[PDB]
Amino acid sequence: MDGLKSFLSTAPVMIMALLTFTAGILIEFNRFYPDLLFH
Amino acid sequence: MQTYGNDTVQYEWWAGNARFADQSGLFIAAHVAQAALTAFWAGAFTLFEISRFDPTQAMGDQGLILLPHLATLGWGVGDGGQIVDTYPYFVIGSIHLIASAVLGAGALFHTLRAPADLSTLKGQGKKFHFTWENPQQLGIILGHHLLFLGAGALLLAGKAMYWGGLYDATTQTVRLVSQPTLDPLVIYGYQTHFASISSLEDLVGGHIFVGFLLIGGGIWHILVPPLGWAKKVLLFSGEAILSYSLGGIALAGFVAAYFCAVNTLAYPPEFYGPPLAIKLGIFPYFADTVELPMHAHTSRAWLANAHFFLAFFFLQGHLWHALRALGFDFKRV
Amino acid sequence: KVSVDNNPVPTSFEKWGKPGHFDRTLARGPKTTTWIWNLHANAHDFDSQTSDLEDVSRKIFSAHFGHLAVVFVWLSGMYFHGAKFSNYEGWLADPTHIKPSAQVVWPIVGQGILNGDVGGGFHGIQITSGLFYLWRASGFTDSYQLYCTAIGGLVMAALMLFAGWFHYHVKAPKLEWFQNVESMMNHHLAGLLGLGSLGWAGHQIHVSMPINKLLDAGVAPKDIPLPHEFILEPSKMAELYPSFAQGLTPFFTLNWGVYSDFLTFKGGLNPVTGGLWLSDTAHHHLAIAVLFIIAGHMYRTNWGIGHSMKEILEAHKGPFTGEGHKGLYEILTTSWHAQLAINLALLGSLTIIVAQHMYAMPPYPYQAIDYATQLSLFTHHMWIGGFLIVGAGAHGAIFMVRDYDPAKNVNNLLDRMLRHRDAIISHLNWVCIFLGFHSFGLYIHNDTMRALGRPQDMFSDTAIQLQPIFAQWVQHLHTLAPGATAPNALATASYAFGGETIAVAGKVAMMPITLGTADFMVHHIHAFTIHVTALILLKGVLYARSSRLVPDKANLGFRFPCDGPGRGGTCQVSGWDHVFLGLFWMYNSLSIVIFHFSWKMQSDVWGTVSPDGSVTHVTLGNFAQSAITINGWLRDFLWAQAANVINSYGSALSAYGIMFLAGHFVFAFSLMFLFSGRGYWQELIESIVWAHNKLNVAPAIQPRALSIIQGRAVGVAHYLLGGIVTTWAFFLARSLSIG
Amino acid sequence: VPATLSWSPKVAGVMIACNILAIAFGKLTIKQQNVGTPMPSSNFFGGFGLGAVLGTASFGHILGAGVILGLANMGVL
Ligand code: CLA
């Protein structure tokens, strides 16, 4: 389980975790508030 | 088991059932498992054929072999094979399933709890030990088995006379049979027309005679040991008593294939189909007199052809085992 | 025969958190960014990871189970999307009016415009995989039936994942189990392909044929009987096919002509659907199963009868060929790379054969009139078979570098191939220059003659003719085949050879494909470009070990950049670099193959059908006058038919317009990696490393430019990603628009 | 359609003769006739094992299927 924590903390898994979380923010921001060309 | 001069023979796996022939405890466990498997087939395929039963279509042209057997006894049929109740077929087929489960348990009991030899046990389990050498113990086994076989013929007649009543082909109505036959001279005459019986009361009185002869035969084997002349002319070994029984069950299967194919009373045409004619190509097969839709044959044909081919190979199995008992090696040729 | 080792590798996550543990030079952790790239390139190089052949074979066996689990999850996803997010029940009612769709996009940022009107009120991505036509041929009626296949696909993937863990960590087979190739070929011909063909013939006879015969009759899909109802009640099966009343008795008694109502050699296509007759395909799969089970009894096993493949090969010697095939059995039971080179060559050849057979003999209902499905299925199976052919030249060269033992290769077929490499390659060099001059220079000649206003001096059917007379004769023999050389065939094997034009929805299913001067020239273009792709990859295999330039390339490896700038320059001498160059030439070969397919189908096959029987084609027969000239390929194919991919913006096909420009970008992006080189980029990175050292943000993992092989590998990956995504978007937007 | 006939002793006679012709072919040509599982009796089989008995009877059924359907197509049977 300790080595599974290391695999889940590797560079490909963490950048796939972050970019999913980042796309999770941007999709959910553009679903409730779409079409934001300016402020 | 005839192991000739070697007397300690490893039997491998393709002939692996010869290992327990001298082991009395494992001899019970195989045979009760056979009685479990036989009662399971009587239980499952009664309920299988209840589910695959159309009451509009006749039972003969459906591939059903167990429901016509109960219909001849008088269960589930009112007048003409329409089958209006079909609940006592379920109850009889259900009882054999639990009876297979009890016999399935006693097979696993004698495999594991009881030892491979019954001489290890003390009490009445020691007295049930048998070997293929002492003649008195094998007559004790033969005595009680003839008593229950005689009781089965009596409880057939007790069903046929008091509670229930069989089915007659002519004047199609379940009977009660209050006056069966009892004369020995009219029951001796069926050595020439056993297949062409048409009296329901004569079938009961024959079974009264058989159910009393086998009870008297079982009393005779339980009070008298096998005699000297029977010991001289018959080998008492393992696959020699099996050899007489394989030939005994082959002659019974040839008669049962003959009674199924042509008798109209014990196998009524409303349940099984029309009676057959004895044909002979390369083998004596029983053919249908009238044609049937598709390649499906009637229930009487499916019973008589199967039982003749089973009685042929159980006659060949008798010839195989009796040659093994007499001393033919089968590696000599 | 069955010999396994009990628990050779423990199951733990210790090596999960230690990447690069499989390689000795990567277990020390990173020092440069080359470590990250070498981690991925060496991950599946099991022969380089392990010296023991037994442990290499154990890694390969469990990797298949993991790969099969990927395929079942992909197969489960296709059946789940057909069950939950598809108009399959809508399409099954009206196949001629509802378009197949099985992908629904989420409505965000304007991408919900891709959910176009596919008919029946459904909105989604119009699929071109042909899954709907496959499922109608399988007898799929309800969406619950596709859901049950999708659940069982996930169950099979979990059993594939369990078998990979079991056969590596619990009971891993020994090397002698892997090297029993006679038992493996017996169980794969008879048990895998034979029983799979027998099972599918059993499925087609019982499920596919009764459902599709009622679907063609006009029964609504809600009123089709269920597949087990034919199994349970044979009255419905006997109503459709009266031979089922006779049962299995005509099968066992060799009275096989009873079954001729559902086991037909009918040929042609079903006029209701445009697909093959499922009576033909069930009889095809029955005959294939019997021959495959028979062929799976050929090889010697525990019971003495059979063939030893060593004794077959060592018997096949000759006067021209020395010791013959002696030692090829020891090659093909020791080297996994030699086996993979044969299997990739033939699976790649098979996938191309699948592409060329499914357009002209369409096996699925309503597939032939779906011009998008016909174009995509040809193109996808062309491209898949193209990569696998290049991988044959790859692992042929990996075997020659690594697993070629000259001690057991003396005067055999492989040794003698090596002993006349200059004879093979230079004659293959000659035939490529000959075919390039005599196919492409034919195109250059009449491009010039048409530009000079000399149409009489061209290579065309109006001018100097180059008729494909041998292919026209073979086409004529197949038209005359029913009744003369196939007397029990009622129709032809394919209408592409000649005869009837099949119409289904007022739309051409299959038409005679007439081969003229333009079909002569493009077939020699295909003969040219396949030969060059054969030339580069056979030069990679033969000269993997040595050449007159670098005589010790076997010590350098399979995958090395060069042997320096000396001897004039030994740039791209490795066996890997011929795979790198062969990937371009496979792309160049197969792009013309699918462009020949796309134009000849639309100009001369596909189109609408007049009620009197006339055919109005998609591009109105412009192949015979414009596919003889490069400009006609530019104008009447590339410029004309990509109007649908560039005017698709603001419509449901606009993602094809996006992906058309997306593949144009990555093709151009590849030329940064292909044309440049890493000594430029390493000197640029160390200037950027200075700006990171200025801000104290220089990483401990030192930034390096990609290696020379990698810069070729990235460049060939982006070229073939970009060039194929362009053609995929061009083909799919054009063929969805037409019809 | 090619002509096929129902089962008959004529059909059985050709099949047994095709089994016999492959048994004689298998006696002459099989290199390993007794390797692996043997017969219960080695005699009356030419020294064949279980693989050679099943191998020759399968070839005689393949030849049995090929000849019978070939002769029924030509109308000989
Ligand atoms: C009441 C029945 C009976 C009894 C108790 C015995 C007892 C014995 N027999 Mg057998 N024998 C009999 C009947 C009987 N047999 C019959 C009917 C045949 C003629 C075919 C023979 C012929 C025979 C031979 C050929 C041999 C024996 C052998 C044996 C011994 C080993 C058992 C064995 O091999 O099992 C193991 C069981 C199997 C490996 C299973 C085999 C399955 C068969 C081949 C398939 C049959 C399927 C059937 C056709 C389907 C029926 C369908 C249904 C609807 C009717 C055992 C002591 C052996 C012996 O004497 O040496 C010790 C020996 O080699 N017997």
Ligand code: CLA
């Ligand atoms: C526009 C594309 C282009 C052209 C024309 C060439 C040309 C050539 N390639 Mg190719 N190739 C290309 C792109 C191109 N390549 C790219 C993108 C790659 C990098 C991956 C490669 C990599 C490469 C490899 C890896 C291989 C080739 C080989 C060849 C030759 C093919 C056989 C041959 O001689 O055909 C005949 C020549 C032609 C078709 C060229 C056109 C000639 C015209 C029709 C005749 C002109 C007449 C002339 C001008 C009259 C003289 C008058 C005077 C005033 C000049 C040929 C010299 C192969 C080879 O050498 O095989 C033997 C081979 O090994 N190519």
Ligand SMILES: CCCCCCCCCCCCO[C@@H]1O[C@H](CO)[C@@H](O[C@H]2O[C@H](CO)[C@@H](O)[C@H](O)[C@H]2O)[C@H](O)[C@H]1O
């Ligand atoms: C005995 C040994 C024989 C060796 C055989 C070697 C191959 C010989 C090839 C013979 C070539 C036949 O010659 C060629 O025949 C075909 C079809 O028959 C004709 O082709 C004709 O039908 C085809 C369709 O099938 C049309 O596409 C074509 O436009 C038309 O002309 C050609 O006009 C003729 O040039």
Ligand SMILES: CC1=C(C/C=C(\C)CCC[C@H](C)CCC[C@H](C)CCCC(C)C)C(=O)c2ccccc2C1=O
């Ligand atoms: C641009 C270029 C470089 C520089 C390229 C480098 C250093 C690689 C840059 C990689 C970046 C950091 C990421 C690239 C994209 C990732 C592979 C995507 C990963 C997925 C993300 C979502 C995380 C070379 O090193 C080179 C070498 C030899 C010939 C040509 C060239 C060449 O053209």
